[PDB]
Curated annotation (Swiss-Prot), chain B:
Interacts with capsid protein VP0 and capsid protein VP1 to form heterotrimeric protomers. Five protomers subsequently associate to form pentamers which serve as building blocks for the capsid. Interacts with capsid protein VP4 in the mature capsid. Interacts with protein 2C; this interaction may be important for virion morphogenesis. It is found in: Virion; Host cytoplasm. It comes from the Viruses. This is Capsid protein VP3. Forms an icosahedral capsid of pseudo T=3 symmetry with capsid proteins VP2 and VP3. The capsid is 300 Angstroms in diameter, composed of 60 copies of each capsid protein and enclosing the viral positive strand RNA genome. Disulfide bonds: none annotated.
């Protein structure tokens, strides 16, 4: 069948038995930087199978009033494995990904999600005189979550889905690489992002290449007596990571 | 035999997700484990097993 | 569970949290309590050396 | 005389054996036969199962 | 010769081939290599499965009984041995042969015969070196009933004479059975009525080994003891069986007492 | 073959070549011949370095322990031997193997077993010749706990039976180690916490040799003693070490007591 | 001339202008493990230029009553760089070295040192019923130092040079790879050790491959008014490091 | 049978050896190998030092 896939990177493997293909974002499969597009004149370390391998981010509960979630990358892998120990000793880095969202549910459950990788998602702010504080963009391995209705804070991110926290129609997030996890077909989505930036490598800590967003487009609904907790787990594996410009520990 | 020099690691098993099952089926299932060697497996040097014993001849 | 059939199966079940660790035991066949009375533990306890990959098949 | 290879260890090595008796049950034990055939306790199935395919289609 | 399979390298994969998934709803066990669940590297592997043959497994000598007999009747030892051949007296040699349903093999019987003087009131005791006779009576022959009678003339019976201080005496016994293999488990009965002896003891009928001191009794007297050792050779063993879990009770039965599968653990999760 | 270098003649020299000057500020030791500091003559030299190989150096048998055991328990000797194999009991064989960091070799174990009668109140004592059993239990096997128990059935354990008056019994033990050579100095610890046993005794785990009198005890009783002798063969020894300067203290440690480099002299200038 | 050398490993370089050669220990230059001598059936990470590079251990003062120093390896690089972060995530490792001891002094100073790399140096103990505690063998980057006379402790290492803390004549440490830093010729010593062990790789934490020892064989002496502090600095660079058998952080 | 030269002394001389066992660890010890290589404990230096030249130029 075409419902079965296996992905092996490093020493990790992830398998699915309800799947709809793989979406290669922009039709470019990630690969190492060429010598015609280089700009840094020193040997890049390429750890290979020590950093390219599935990492699992914290699971989030899909409630029936949930409005979505987002994780900014690569700030969600800053604490994961040896990937996160090579962002703290290098001024540069580049790396594709292969985000795999997974969320099984019975055949008596219903609901729909939009899994979408947004390059350069720049978030708004509740106050229009301020730009959001760091803690309100990123949670690390823990997702920051959208709210159904417009929120008012001060340095808080403006979270309303209907704007997607960017001031663009939420239904128009579809030119960006995406798949839908709909609970009557597949139960997994695989999006292989390449490295998308306007410079060949860029500092991992400072700059966030893309932002995954999972937005319920039809609420989770089930007849009571069925399972009342269904989690959404996001795993993501770096692909063709290379880092360059070694220096001391930290990110001060 | 158990020897601290040449410890062989640990097996562990965790819930990746959860067992999700409809209303009208059981909430308890079972996992069983099997064990077999691969085709690269070999042994050396005989010794008698210590799982069997006797005090005197059987008669 | 040692003199019943309950020995050979570990109960996995729907949980309302995430569930912890179903089981875990030190690997070391023929000296681990778990693995030493199987067929890769009563055919290793006639030997004092072993090598190569083994495999566990869950069901 | 039968001349046969010894058990050699990995990275001369011959031995000579002459049978002195008139019965073949007086010969020294075989220990040089390492033949195997695992696939009849290990894969006893009637129809071949290919590893890379799912077992149950 | 026999050698283990090599490990073969593979890179990452992300294909629609699943080696890892299988269904053990069939007798077919998984054939996965460690080259199917992680990348591995090419390892040229020189290990040999040369000590796990059935002619290295079973081909070491093992004790199967001792019989004691005396030159003065120490304490109910008579003056001759007697012992109806079977492999079931011990729990060592027995267990390894009850790990196969059928075995054909050519034994080597080696006897190790030792003696010790008795407690006695005899004084100025000097004995010449003992000579011991070990006679094998195939089933249905005449049986001795005393230290000296006509049966020990060994008119056609195999017999070994051996004098103490020499190397242990040995001989080979060819594959001798009615069957085309020895039977280690018989599920039938002796009779056709399903009556009488049940189990493997029905088919067992391998004759009897007697032994005595050749020498006429000295005043002090001695007690000799003979230890029989069987070493299989030329072994072909058919149909494997799970090895025993339980201690044996009897040498003619498999009766067993219900015993634990495995030793305790504290919990499911233990380091 | 191996032979010493010849001395080659040279006449007087008065050149700008200095063989004699060197700098030992490098690991490079001087390579000067005696043909570089005085004239010499051609000497065709037939000496062989044939007894200074490592398979002539190490390839002579040497005692490594004696164990005593008794047939009546003379004075805390039990009725069986026991001795966990190591080469560290002696200071002879030990020193020559602590002159190399790693050695792989195939031993020959030769046992020399002798007995003597005890002081006892028994009279009219005549014992038949003794038979002794020497069993080798590879590590993790079952261990005997008495003179007669099931462990001495030697169901798969190597074992030698020998009767007094015959030539010393010997056997070969192949190179058996986890490593690719035996380790004579280990700088690590057993644990990963740097706790527990330290030194070479961490890696040592070569099983145990037991022995007993096969014969049932006679009235007078005897005390036997067994001397084990190891002779290396097929020796490849890697990484040399300075030989010991200090007397040993323990057989599991290198602990030593501080000792003089050399014996005294009266003064710098002594005839 | 032959007094000048340069060694470049990684991004580090070390140069000398008074030098006596390089002593390649046992005439084997370090190199990666072959596939005929392998024993571990998984891909080894080989960081290359991220771990092979000169690291500098703490300098020790050479006094006129000093009796020597020793550093056990690789327990002196357990805290250094990314070498030390790949001993804590791997069960195995192997790596040659290129120890470079350096110690300049004027032409009016005099003194002599023996720089010697002792494979498998197993140290004694003051009490003959005890084996020395961990803290008395290793100091990490800080050398443990020999004492002139016999010491009495309990779990203390028996330190007397005349036995070299091993019960062997101290003048006989010369079959081991060595050079002498004599202050009227050279002022540096370079010993390139290969990986010497009886198994192909071994756990870095547990087992110490070799032990450098620096032993004054002629005391430092100078006419007063000259410099009274001359340090000895030891740098060492891993060569052809590879690690294998990745697992969690630590060494518990 | 392997026929090999004896240890002869300087200014027949053959011996015959037959191996009787199936293991090569049962063979009598080598004592005829006199191979050497002193130059790795004696001259371990990276760059060759010629005897006639000064060591330190």
């Amino acid at each position: 069948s075409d419902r079965v896939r296996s992905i092996t990177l490093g020493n990790s493997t992830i398998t699915t038995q309800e799947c709809a293909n793989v979406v290669v974002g922009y039709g470019v499969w990630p690969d190492y930087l060429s010598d015609e597009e280089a700009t840094a004149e020193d040997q890049p370390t390429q750890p290979d199978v020590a950093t390219c391998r599935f990492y699992t981010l914290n699971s989030v509960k899909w409630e029936m009033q949930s409005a979505g979630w987002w994780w900014k990358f690569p700030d969600a892998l800053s604490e994961m494995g040896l990937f996160g120990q090579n962002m703290q000793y290098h001024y540069l880095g580049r790396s594709g990904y292969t985000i795999h969202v997974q969320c099984n549910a019975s055949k008596f459950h219903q609901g729909c999600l939009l899994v979408v990788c947004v390059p350069e998602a720049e978030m708004g702010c509740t106050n229009a005189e301020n730009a959001p504080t760091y803690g309100d963009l990123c949670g690390g391995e823990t997702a920051k979550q959208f709210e159904q209705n417009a929120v008012t804070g001060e340095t808080a991110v403006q979270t309303a889905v209907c704007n997607a926290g960017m001031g663009v129609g939420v239904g128009n997030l579809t030119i960006y690489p995406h798949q839908w996890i709909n609970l009557r077909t597949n139960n997994s989505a695989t999006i292989v992002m390449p490295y998308i930036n306007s410079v060949p490598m860029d500092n991992m800590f400072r700059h966030n290449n893309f932002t995954l967003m999972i937005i319920p487009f039809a609420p989770l609904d089930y007849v009571t007596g069925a399972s009342s907790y269904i989690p959404i787990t996001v795993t993501v594996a770096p692909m063709s990571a290379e880092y360059n410009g070694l220096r001391l520990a930290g990110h001060q | 035999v158990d020897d601290k020099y040449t410890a062989s690691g640990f097996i562990s098993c965790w819930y990746q997700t959860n067992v999700i099952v409809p209303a009208e089926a059981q909430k308890s299932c079972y996992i069983m484990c099997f064990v077999s060697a691969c085709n690269d497996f070999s042994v050396r040097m005989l010794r008698d097993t210590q799982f069997i014993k006797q005090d005197t001849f059987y008669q | 569970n040692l003199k019943t059939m309950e020995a050979y199966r570990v109960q996995v079940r729907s949980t309302d949290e995430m569930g912890g660790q179903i089981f875990g035991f030190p690997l070391q066949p023929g000296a681990s309590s778990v693995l030493q009375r199987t067929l890769l533990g009563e055919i290793l306890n006639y030997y004092t050396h072993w090598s190569g990959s083994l495999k566990l098949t869950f069901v | 005389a039968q001349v046969s290879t010894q058990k050699t260890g990995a990275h001369i090595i011959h031995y000579t054996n002459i049978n002195y008796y008139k019965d073949a049950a007086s010969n020294s034990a075989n220990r040089q036969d390492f033949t195997q055939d695992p696939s009849k306790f290990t894969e006893p199935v009637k129809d071949v199962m290919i590893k890379s395919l799912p077992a149950l289609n | 010769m026999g050698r283990v399979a090599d490990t073969i390298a593979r890179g990452p994969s992300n294909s629609e081939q699943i080696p890892a998934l299988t269904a053990v709803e069939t007798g077919h066990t998984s054939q996965v290599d460690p080259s199917d669940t992680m990348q591995t590297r090419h390892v040229h592997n020189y290990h040999s499965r040369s000590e796990s043959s059935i002619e290295n497994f079973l081909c070491r000598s093992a004790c199967v009984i001792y019989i004691k007999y005396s030159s003065a009747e120490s304490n109910n030892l008579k003056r001759y041995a007697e012992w109806v051949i079977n492999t079931r007296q011990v729990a060592q040699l027995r267990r390894k042969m009850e790990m196969f349903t059928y075995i054909r093999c050519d034994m080597e019987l080696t006897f190790v015969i030792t003696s010790h003087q008795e407690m006695s009131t005899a004084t100025n005791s000097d004995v010449p070196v003992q000579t011991h006779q070990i006679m094998y009576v195939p089933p249905g022959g005449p049986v001795p009933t005393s230290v000296n009678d006509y049966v020990w003339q060994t008119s056609t019976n195999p017999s070994i004479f051996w004098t103490e201080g020499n190397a242990p005496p040995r001989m080979s016994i060819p594959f001798m059975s009615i069957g085309n293999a020895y039977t280690m488990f018989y599920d039938g009965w002796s009779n056709f009525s399903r009556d009488g002896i049940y189990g493997y003891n029905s088919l067992n009928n391998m004759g009897t080994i007697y032994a005595r001191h050749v020498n006429d009794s000295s005043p002090g007297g001695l007690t000799s003891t003979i230890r029989i050792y069987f070493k299989p050779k030329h072994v072909k063993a058919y149909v494997p069986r799970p090895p025993r879990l339980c201690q044996y009770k009897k040498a003619k039965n498999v009766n067993f007492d219900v015993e634990a599968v495995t030793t305790e653990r504290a919990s499911l999760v233990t380091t």
